[PDB]
Write a protein that binds this ligand. Structure first.
Ligand SMILES: *C/C=C(\C)CC/C=C(\C)CC/C=C(\C)CCC=C(C)C
Ligand SMILES: [Zn+2]
Lengths: 314, 346, 6
């Protein structure tokens, strides 16, 4: 109703409808620590909020008071909780609250309390009809917003809405193949639907990733996905991969590729492969290439890896 | 350029004093800002510039003690501040019942943590009540919530629970088996740890996960050597000069601790590049007001000031105490905590 | 800008 910046805004202490309530002030004792200074207006809203809370007053005026408290500080989790208590008590229209929270989140997309509030609402309404679109809008201002992706996965899982996510993922990877959040979403969708045990799916994915790697060879995310979906099956069990990678080395080289190779060679050594002492030498040679010229910043790490391989396979 | 130690000391002093209305969003978590400042001064060996006694009383006024009828045990712990308007009572009289007053796991953690840093012996801490409250926060999947009234649940709070149990030297506060299960289930296909199963692995959650296991003394038991190698790889790949929290994201000073501390716990921080890291951290130093920012020429805050300093500590900066990488307090403090635990066992 | 942890 009465906006906090309206020319006709009136402090609660001067409102007739609130004359029966005694405001409760905050006190940090004799010597306050990390004390925040509040304006007349700010302290006024919260002095009445404390009053209403302390008395657990489930009133309409209290409900309106929370809107102001939230405007002053949307990170106060207690205010949001009380507002939810009121939403139930006064049996307020939840579809309207959805509009409210939708606006609040747009202006404060990194706030934990607002995302939690929206999730509780969707659970109450058992209605996810507008979630995917809402989240897509937020992800549009920040494609890596952890809160947004978290909520998106919750919705998709809770209401089983997998049908179009893999397509959404493909679209975002086109907009920015370097978005680590999207590659994670891709693995989320697949491993929760078809899975990776279907050789046809695995092949589709390994092929898709190599295509992306060819487009932008220096992309940790793509390489992490590729290694991720194969590492548990056994990197050494894919002979054509080893050579397809060695063929990229000429032009499409990068520390990620070199590293992958080292990991392949290590899987081989771990699986009593043929020409053991020769493989180990191929590995060590790469570790040194990484340390001395390809991933210099991790120089001491790669040499540490090298020493590790030697003392384990000799 | 160089480490402006004195400037940062004043910065933390100011944080403990008064904050501008523009930091109102921290009201309910002022206790963590206190922690950043106190622990930061401790780290700079300057706790003398504050009145340890006043601050200890303030902290104790934030403890949610059980009521006469002990009917609110599931809600005990510490408050982030006095925002509810409860009369200042430094853990003296019993508990003044209130419909919505209860602890917050991150505040119980930073609260106990602050008390120890200030030298208090935790005698006024109703240890059993806190542990009772902690248990009430754990979910079926093993993770934790921040408050009994309900909240989001993730790795951040698993770490808080772990620290609380560790400091009170009693793990009855959690079902460790289920917590460990949660931590395992959060490992991603790329080998880092995420806030929860299926989510994108992140530097912050990886720290929370690994540090939690270390605090429980079960790192080795929970992850295989192959697994730990994969995690180490994911972590060390985070260094660009400074550290970022996720692949393909710009670096941020605080990750020098989040990720650096993880690498330290995994015993391979020694193999990272110190110079480039130190140079980045310092480049985000505010030479005028003190403290550190996330990026150079950016506004400083308590969080980055504290973690930037802890990041520097990992490499033994001249003038900064060694930090306990898993407990997030100075080794001096961790040591004092050992003495404390010993004394109790009598 | 700033980092929100709570
Ligand atoms: C830019 C930095 C961001 C977004 C934070 C990343 C770090 C995270 C999520 C770790 C959070 C840890 C918590 C809440 C427990 C420890 C809390 C304190 C030390 C106050
Ligand atoms: Zn940061």
């Amino acid at each position: 109703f009465l906006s906090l910046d309206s020319p006709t805004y009136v402090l609660y202490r001067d409102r007739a409808e609130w004359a029966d309530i005694d405001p409760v002030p905050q006190n940090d004792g004799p010597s306050p620590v990390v004390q925040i200074i509040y304006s007349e207006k700010f302290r006024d809203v919260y002095d009445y909020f404390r009053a209403v809370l302390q008395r657990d007053e489930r009133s309409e005026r209290a409900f309106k008071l929370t809107r102001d408290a939230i405007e002053l500080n949307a990170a106060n989790y207690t205010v949001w909780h009380f507002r939810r208590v009121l939403l139930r008590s006064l049996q307020k229209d939840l579809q309207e609250e959805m509009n409210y929270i939708i606006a609040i989140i747009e202006e404060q997309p990194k706030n934990y309390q607002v995302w939690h509030h929206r999730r509780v609402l969707v659970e109450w309404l058992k209605d996810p009809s507008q979630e995917l679109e809402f989240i897509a809008d937020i992800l549009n201002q920040d494609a890596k917003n952890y809160h947004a992706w978290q909520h998106r996965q919750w919705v998709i899982q809770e209401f089983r809405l997998w049908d179009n996510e893999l397509q959404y993922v493909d679209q975002l990877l086109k907009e920015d193949v370097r978005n680590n959040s999207v590659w994670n979403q891709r693995h989320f969708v697949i491993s929760n639907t078809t899975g990776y045990s279907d050789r046809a799916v695995l092949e589709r994915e390994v092929q898709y990733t190599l295509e992306m790697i060819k487009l932008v060879p220096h992309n940790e995310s793509a390489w992490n996905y590729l290694k991720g979906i194969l590492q548990d099956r056994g990197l050494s069990r894919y002979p054509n991969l080893l050579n397809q990678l060695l063929d990229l080395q000429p032009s499409h080289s990068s520390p990620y590729l070199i590293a992958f190779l080292v990991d392949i060679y290590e899987d081989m050594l771990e699986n009593q492969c043929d020409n053991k002492e020769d493989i180990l030498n191929k590995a060590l040679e790469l570790c040194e290439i990484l340390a001395k010229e390809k991933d210099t910043i991790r120089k001491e790490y790669w040499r540490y890896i090298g020493r590790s391989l030697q003392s384990k396979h000799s | 350029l160089d480490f402006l130690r004195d400037r940062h000391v004043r910065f933390f002093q100011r944080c403990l004093q008064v904050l501008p209305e523009r930091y109102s969003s921290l009201e309910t978590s002022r206790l963590t800002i206190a922690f950043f400042a106190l622990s930061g001064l401790d780290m700079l060996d300057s706790l003398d510039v504050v009145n340890k006694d006043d601050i200890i009383e303030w902290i104790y006024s934030l403890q949610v003690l059980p009521t006469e009828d002990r009917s609110n045990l599931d809600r005990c712990g510490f408050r982030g501040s006095s925002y509810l308007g409860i009369p200042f009572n430094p853990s003296k009289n019993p508990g003044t019942a209130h419909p919505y007053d209860s602890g917050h796991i991150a505040m119980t953690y930073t609260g106990l943590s602050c008390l120890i840093i200030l030298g208090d012996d935790l005698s006024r801490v109703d240890k059993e009540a806190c542990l009772a409250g902690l248990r009430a926060l754990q979910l079926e999947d093993g993770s934790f919530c921040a408050v009994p009234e309900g909240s989001e649940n993730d790795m951040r709070f698993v770490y808080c629970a772990s620290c609380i149990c560790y400091m009170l030297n009693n793990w009855s506060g959690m079902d460790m088996k289920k917590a460990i299960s949660y931590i395992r289930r959060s490992m991603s296909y790329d080998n880092g740890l995420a806030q929860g199963a299926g989510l994108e692995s992140h530097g912050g959650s990886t720290f929370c996960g690994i540090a939690s296991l270390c605090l429980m003394g079960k790192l080795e038991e929970v992850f295989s050597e192959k697994e730990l190698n994969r995690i180490k790889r994911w972590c060390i790949m985070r260094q660009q000069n400074g550290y970022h929290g996720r692949p393909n994201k710009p670096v941020d000073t605080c990750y020098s601790f989040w990720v650096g501390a993880t690498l330290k716990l995994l015993k391979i921080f020694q193999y990272t590049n110190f110079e480039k890291n130190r140079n980045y951290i310092l480049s985000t130093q505010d030479r005028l007001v003190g403290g550190f920012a996330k990026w150079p020429d950016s506004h400083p805050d308590a969080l980055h000031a504290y973690f930037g300093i802890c990041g520097l500590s990992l490499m033994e900066e001249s003038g900064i105490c060694k930090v306990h990488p898993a407990l997030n307090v100075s080794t001096r403090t961790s040591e004092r905590l050992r003495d404390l635990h010993q004394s109790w066992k009598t | 800008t700033k980092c929100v942890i709570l």
